[model samples]
Target chain A: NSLALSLTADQMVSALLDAEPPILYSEYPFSEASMMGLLTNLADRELVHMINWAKRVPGFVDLTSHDQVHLLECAWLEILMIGLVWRSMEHPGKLLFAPNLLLDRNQGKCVEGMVEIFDMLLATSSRFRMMNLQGEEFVCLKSIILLNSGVYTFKSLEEKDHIHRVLDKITDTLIHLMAKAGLTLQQQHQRLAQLLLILSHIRHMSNKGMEHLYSMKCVVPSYDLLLEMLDAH
Target chain B: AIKRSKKNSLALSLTADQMVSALLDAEPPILYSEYDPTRPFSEASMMGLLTNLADRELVHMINWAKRVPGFVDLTSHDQVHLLECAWLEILMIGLVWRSMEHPGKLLFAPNLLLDRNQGKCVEGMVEIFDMLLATSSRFRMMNLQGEEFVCLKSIILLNSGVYTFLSSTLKSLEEKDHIHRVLDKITDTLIHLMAKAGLTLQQQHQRLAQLLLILSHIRHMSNKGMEHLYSMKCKNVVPSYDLLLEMLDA
Candidate 1:
């Protein structure tokens, strides 16, 4: 499907985010072996979606492959997390992972900066919750974030503004939605400020998460799946 | 019968029936989305269960947090800040755990059940509903079960971004060591539990890292709810203070 034209923002991101290996854990404490195996599967599926999503963006084809590759390399985790926010559970902390599976905080215990990360996620989710973010808004945010190219790898002024133009269009769509949705200019400005604020957080978290991943990768050997993300010898 | 069927997987080592019954035992909460499911899988039932479970799990969460040893030792301001910051995270995990083995739909009492469409919230409200769904998909994809789920939330709770109070409040010099020790026992147990599933340093790190990445969403969602109500003057339909603060308080 043509991205954003025929699909909702969620629909556009869904292909990359909606992945699930077709097996259920038949028992408890499942297995790390099993989890990694599935992650490997998801990782592979995601790369394909990543490639397609990258290809689908209007100005993506105009960029040098190096820039495209770098953008993908840098933005992948952010995209993944963006998808996670959409699929979060109805209640505050619970994640309705699959129809049959769920994860709570203790169940999803991570290490190191878990506290800070949780705060970032909760605050991000809260803004989205408050603003009532939509697929259109979501895609704009996604497009804006990716297009901003936080990696600072854009090749030229022309190429950079190509992204900027796309972002302007997306921003206009949000403004359009605000106007159409009956929000006053004050509420619209308030809402726009809130959205960009949330986007700023995503930008921050993306780089932070990417740094952590590659840094950790140096100290430890990675398996087959992750190399697709960071590359391996 | 319903709980037994789903009893194989649940949270805090509680059965679905146990948790649901406990929630049900409390009689009811949430002024919106209240309902009764006659069979086992009513369209409205899942949402109903979540609202109910959230209502009861809140009490458990407060109790659990209080028992954390150093929590009560903090001043009330510090305690409230920590609770406010950490509350949404804990509430999110509980709903995630309680909502395991369910599909997309959020319930509340007084009768409202929202699927992806109506109540679901992609209303551009909590715009991340589907991402949260995808987060749920991660657990199923990982094949994480009950013990794993409990262990994950436990780790999430023990580590607090209590940093909110660090600036304007009393900074106790003595509490660090005690909190650290308690956290170590927890960290040790969680690492052990994560490893019990056969994770290497990298595997544990990868999963932990991904989890941390995703958990930020829940915090954002919780904070979003707080901002919404906190901004509201309670002149209209929303629950400005009272239970929503408790219900989705973060």
Candidate 2:
């Protein structure tokens, strides 16, 4: 019995790591990296190899910045919808996907058809990261990009714009989820408290006042409208 | 009653400072003492005495030390008496002041020492109470099932004490910032304790249900308290109950 316990600890650790790999790699060239690619042919191959590596890694998910930006451009509505559906289900872990890539595809689906692709995706894969608890791992992928931005490399205006757009999408998605969750007034208040905490962290990272803008435009209005709209719902 | 007699005897025997120390050190072994396992002190009487001493000087009797000889043990009723008297002396006045100002804007600077004092009191009380309950000749000991009622009563009282202390502390606060701080501390403590307790007593379904019921009550009261605080012009800390109701309706 004692040996069984000891052996299970190691097995469990290995199983967990197998189930959800901690590190994710980006496949597509960040806009800044594209400039570097123009100077070296090898740069393109390196990027492709990195993407392939990310795909093959057991727990690794692709978190390409371009896909992220693309997902944000559409206001992260799909991601929010997906998140809501996932949160509503029992054992959200059953629906895992490569969050960064899945979100990218979602952005594409939205633009191509403006159709709800949740059912299609659900049919194909039992798990989705964007809505899964494990999905939180993908936040690291964006954090890395944001941390690298404008310091080690210069990003174009459009790229920066896309970054802001994605952030806005995330904020909006969270607001939409809150509205859909049918959380009580007290619960919404608690959610606002949590949102403020996130906003504070984001504000600390970016000086562009994006956090402030999102708070004012998205968070404040949604929180205010929460009761009124929820009542109607 | 015998416990109270012992405690009173001990109090009389000790000097003013010794009395305080004795009260602080004498862990009242009473039912429901281990309600908060986090803190060091558990006796309610100890806390009451400390609060009383904080407000007023202790009176010494002639030959008190020589005649009394040692620390006194208190009964549950005596403990309650001490607690009520302490509340009447300090907290009641503070509550009155808070009520006069604003509904929800009340904040109180918690004396950390008081928390420590109460923790010790609870521990002592639990120890003695368990011993007495076990050795009592009146009660018939049966199989494991027979002790269920006693266990339930103790657990309920312990849970009630936690809620009562939190509610009382929250009600004492008059300042918005202070109220927020107190709420943060109290809720965080309650949440963490509840989670741990839930895990520890995993198979105790009835106990778990009772604990959850108490927890829900605490959460509800705390929400109301926060609303009352926000109504005092402080920013709302959490979503209002009305909003939650609306969301469910939606």
Candidate 3:
């Protein structure tokens, strides 16, 4: 049976409005099985083409500034993760979703999202700050999770020597995405004009998943550590 | 006529070099003298004269010591006296050697001479300690009580001099017990002086931590043990042993 698909921006908006708030907020509410089903049905009936056509609709262009900001922030984490994955996997083409949709429309929105998340976490909990050498303080996102977990799962895995292998897999995926999206090192560093275009496309596809993860406080030590390590390199 | 007579009188007076020779000629033999070991040498009178010559730049005592062939290659007694007289020179030598682009020449001088005469070097070091104690105004200037000068000199010498000697020149010594005794004295002196100086908790901790770290590094190639010990001694200090070890291992 084919699920009915929205033919216009209004139809899609109305469908979203009808969904329960908690269902929308639930972790991974859009299941892999359901997503696969919807993708197959849309491909089978040419709804994908119609949705692409609706993107050019004048009504879509008229979204309010607040709405635009909300949309971009909500999708930013997914966009960054997808961009990171694509870059690691050497597929630069997939990195386009973030810049094309989110960043191109607004940059302040991205920074606001990062600051909002950091400040929100800091205010709500005493998790981020860690004691450092010299009897000083420093904040590390990973330490919060390790502290809260009550069990040393990651360290246990590390003891077994699987952590490096897991990190390698993550790195491979990111490199592919970066290559596909044409995100060169130079382009990544130049985030003002051209990079925003790339990030907008990435945000459109990946931000929602990422924001949900952040909201749930699902810390990814390997991901953050790998990024830090790569940045040093 | 009076001016001419005054000029002749002045000319008749000994030249500076001639005065030095005359002084050396008149000096009693150092070896045969039956003087009290604890008492200052009667030759100490000439110390003032030597200082005056140095101040006037009439005699380059330091430069003469530098140019003298086999200056450090003398008998142990002579070496001891030379070192006592030239403690400032030795300090300067150490500073220059460590800072130089090519340290081969400077490094060789200390290693060859001092390595063989460790006992005499120790004696010389103690004499230098007494010299420092006599000059430093910890008591008179600051109104400090008795034994403060002794305690301060002992700590400073241990930290600044003996510590270096142990870590660098005396590392492979067979007599560990004696070396440790010296180190204990140094540590005790430091602790005593810190209390007398009324050092703040933070300052005390920092000094203790630095000394511990230096000891740890001297003992092991990695300084992580020292860092760990320091962290244990202070609140909120980072446990950086693992991190430091990882860096060293890498």
Q: Deviation in angstroms for A202 in model 1?
A: 9.3
Error of 2 at A10 (Å): 37
List each candidate's DockQ score.
0.02, 0.02, 0.01
How would you encode candidate 2's per-residue C-alpha lDDT over A46-99 as one tens digit per residue?
333233322332221222444333323222222223333343344232322323
Model 3 stretches astray by more than 4 angstroms: A1-233, B1-86, B89-146, B156-181, B193-200, B203-250
Q: Write one digit per residue (lDDT tens) for candidate 3, span A102-168.
A: 1121221233243333222221121111111010001111111112111111134332123222212
Model 1 spans > 4 angstroms off: A1-233, B1-57, B73-76, B106-114, B120-126, B158-160, B167-171, B176-181, B228-235, B242-250
Query: Residue by residue across B1-250, what tens digits does model 2's lDDT show?
Result: 3433322343334333343333233222211122233544323444443334423321211112112222013223322332322222222222222222222222122222222223234333332222222222112221222123222222222222221121123322222122222222222332333344453322232222222222222222223232333443233322245664465346
lDDT of 3 by residue, B1-250 (tens): 2322222322124443332343234322211112234543322322222233223331233343322222222233332334332333333222222223321221222222111122122222333222222222112323433233222222222222211112112321222223223333333444445555787533433333223322211221112222333433343222334664464345
The model with the greater TM-score, 1 or 2, is 1
Looking at model 1, residue B8 earns an lDDT score of 28
Task: Give the per-residue lDDT of model 1 (tens digit) for B1-250.
Answer: 2321111222333432343333333321233334454646532444335545555656667766555433555555455555665666676555454444556743322354345564342223344444445455545555665644554454444344432222222253233333333333433344455667787643543344334434444554555554443443242323334675575455
Report clashes for each candidate as comma-separated counts: 70, 55, 58
Order by lDDT, highest first:
1, 2, 3
Candidate topping lDDT: 1
Q: What is the DockQ of candidate 1?
A: 0.02
TM-score of each: 0.41, 0.18, 0.17
How far off is residue A117 in model 3, in Å?
55
